[PDB]
């Protein structure tokens, strides 16, 4: 009987940050309530000023990470305000039935809906919009995110001992297919609807024009670099709703990796690079051992460095010469 279960309202936060949660559950099963507002908006995705009509959950690409525990209920109030122009919906890969909730959540502009589902399987999972006949266009316009369903007793290593993270970041990687004119210049439209037939042609090339983390080339750099400290245990959740990716932390490793993101399986150890298939979320646990700048990339290095799929960590603390040292610095 759901009516006797505690309810908790959670306020979501912008990626790459994640809302406050407990790793090990301090309550029984709950109904966890979330609200998301669909926003269609113009987004500048690169240094050159290229603009798309993005379709977002809660104003961001990716949409925010939701965090619950195994056998909680998720109750999502989904709002499509009448300033939007398109019909949207939501499919949770975490959910069982009705196309992941897609069949039940169709909202025209000016409508809302509330969906509930039981989170029966532990793991990180993609959610994405999937309206009838326009699925890839919505998804590749930025309308995806992830949800993490933690085991009730938190994460475990390959031997079953606890793994506790100190920080958690969510990296959503996005393939965009911006239409081009005859010569190769990116096209512009006043509305999302205008772009549709050009979008389909661009998608069919199977060749994205931009691949980005957190909505833009260079979004996770500078002032917006991910931070940590030597000694900290960091969990990086990474999703790709449509295309394969192969993450790599330059100067580090994936100590414990769930490449396909499902925590009932033992993690892979000591990964240099791991494959997250399109339509999946993965998670990698790392303990920092050296300070400095790290690049976190898709290790198709063309995708990383030409198309945008690169971000930075800045790590503070003490250098360990035993691990690495310059014996003779560059010289004649």
């Amino acid at each position: 009987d759901i009516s006797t279960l505690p309810r908790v309202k959670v306020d979501l936060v912008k990626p790459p940050f994640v809302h406050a949660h407990d790793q090990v559950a301090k309550t029984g099963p709950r109904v966890v309530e979330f609200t998301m507002t669909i926003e269609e908006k113009k987004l500048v995705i690169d240094r050159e000023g290229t603009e798309i009509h993005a379709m977002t959950f809660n104003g961001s690409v990716p949409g925010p990470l939701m965090v619950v525990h195994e056998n909680d209920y998720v109750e999502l109030r989904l709002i499509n305000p009448d300033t939007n122009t398109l019909l949207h919906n939501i499919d949770f890969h975490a959910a069982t039935g009705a196309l992941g909730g897609g069949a039940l959540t169709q909202v025209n502009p000016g409508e809302e809906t509330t969906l509930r589902f039981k989170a029966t399987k532990p793991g990180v999972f993609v959610y994405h919009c999937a309206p009838e006949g326009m699925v890839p266009w919505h998804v590749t316009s930025g309308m995806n995110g992830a949800i993490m369903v933690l085991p009730r007793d938190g994460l475990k290593d390959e031997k079953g001992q606890p793994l506790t993270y100190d920080k958690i970041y969510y990296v959503g990687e996005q393939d965009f297919y911006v239409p081009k004119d005859e010569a190769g210049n990116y096209k512009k439209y006043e509305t999302p609807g205008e772009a549709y037939e050009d979008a389909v042609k661009a998608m069919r090339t199977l060749t994205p024009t931009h691949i980005v983390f957190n909505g833009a080339v260079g979004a996770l750099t500078g002032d917006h670099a991910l931070t940590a400290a030597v000694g900290e245990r960091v969990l990086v959740v990474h999703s790709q709703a449509n295309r394969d990716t192969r993450p790599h932390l330059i100067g580090g490793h994936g100590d414990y990796v769930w490449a396909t993101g499902k925590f009932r399986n033992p993690p892979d150890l000591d990964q240099e690079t791991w494959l997250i298939p399109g339509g999946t979320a993965g998670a990698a646990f790392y303990t920092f051992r050296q300070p400095g700048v790290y690049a976190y990339v898709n290790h198709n290095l063309i995708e990383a460095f030409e198309l945008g799929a690169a971000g930075h960590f800045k790590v503070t603390g003490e250098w360990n010469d035993d691990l690495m040292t310059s014996v003779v610095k560059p010289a004649s």
Copy 2:
């Protein structure tokens, strides 16, 4: 001594259906005899009437699933009738030696041959035609299928307890590279031989024009949807002879997945999406928990919804509101 072993003749069936077999073996090792006839035929692959000269085992794309047990012998009589125009052969990834049988099975039109091999490794495996100098053209013209070598005691979960399926389907996914004129229109040829140099150029783009399940856009829809009932345990074998795929059951999961298809390994659990590398067969076990329509797709959603890699399940039975429910239906 093979001459003392029982022989059983098996009649193959058209995909997505699979011939009758026993999961747990009720006999000792057998010589299992199959016959396949090569058919070169015109196939319409999409809604627009695009026609290719397909190369098939037994008239279908994919070729039929063959089912044996570990340490049976497979004896295949392969017939290339003189109504065909090309030389064909067969390579079984299940087999050891002579290029998977490829070196021993070269049949011009009007020839036949009989190959025997011992099925020493349990798993689902691709078979495909591979004639000297024309390998990718035959394979990407539809000349591939799979074989399942069950363990003698059937399938097991990650703990080693029995897993028994109630139904089994075979989904062959096919990348086609149909040649285009200057403007983008698909070309037509009277014979397979005519298309050859145009086929090579199209292949070299590495960009397929169509990606389909069971030979055509929409082949596993409507009257041809896969069916099941709530409570049934379904095994879906999925092969891709040439290109990576990432299957996903929309509204469900892969409860137990052998993504690279080899049953001596423990399955991955609770998968949302899994990667089957080109040149591989995989298998996913699911128990249906909700009725309704499910889409089974390659979760590169451009590949799925624009290029054709989508099919349907129709599942009968009782809705479970505990798993999912609409709290407030779409409204103002």
Copy 3:
């Protein structure tokens, strides 16, 4: 204290061969010293005479395999002679800190440097050049290799029993993106520097013109085929620094496969094909059971047979009719 550790100088060998080493360590931890000289040179990559300005470690594509044990120190003297034109460096995915050594190893022409790092994680790992702002261009010009860090007690199977290989080969697979004129002909440049803006445009297509093993179409064929004997246990290390590959031994299997190359994980068994993600090295162990010719390919068969990603094994010994036999040879 490093100064009390034995030092051993190792002379590297050209791929696909690997320098002499011990599988099980016969000493305590050592500082293992290597020297590599960067060579920029013209390379002919295909049968048609297509020429690139390759960037190599030690004159080869790939660079040579380095072999150490877990908790050795690697000390690399890296020389960039003044006959080169570009700045290079080295990133080891085996190493922890400073972008894998990349930040510490920047050498202009006429400079050298010596880097030391502790090999803390067992596995096969990629190394590649990665200069600031020119990373994909150097890597896809051939500037990558691998290092193997063996466990101190050698390799183990999925049950933890020893696995001993009799021979070891290193296959580096390389994606090249040679620029084309308007009509599709490959362009030529007098220097590496000339090609730069054309290289970037070619890379951005994400479509390689050639995919090769060991630097050229047909490099591991004929006189240069890999050899073995029936009964021998062979380890094939395979790396791809930038793009996914899916190796397959035609007529054989991967008995024990570490697809993502990290030996603390149990191997996958009985693989037909396995996925090595771009930015990764993998390793596959096979025992030959039949003589004859085997093809070792990327099983995107367009990549294999049209673009160059195919090599040969020639295996000597006794044919086993029990495994495979032609019952009725091709005939009317």
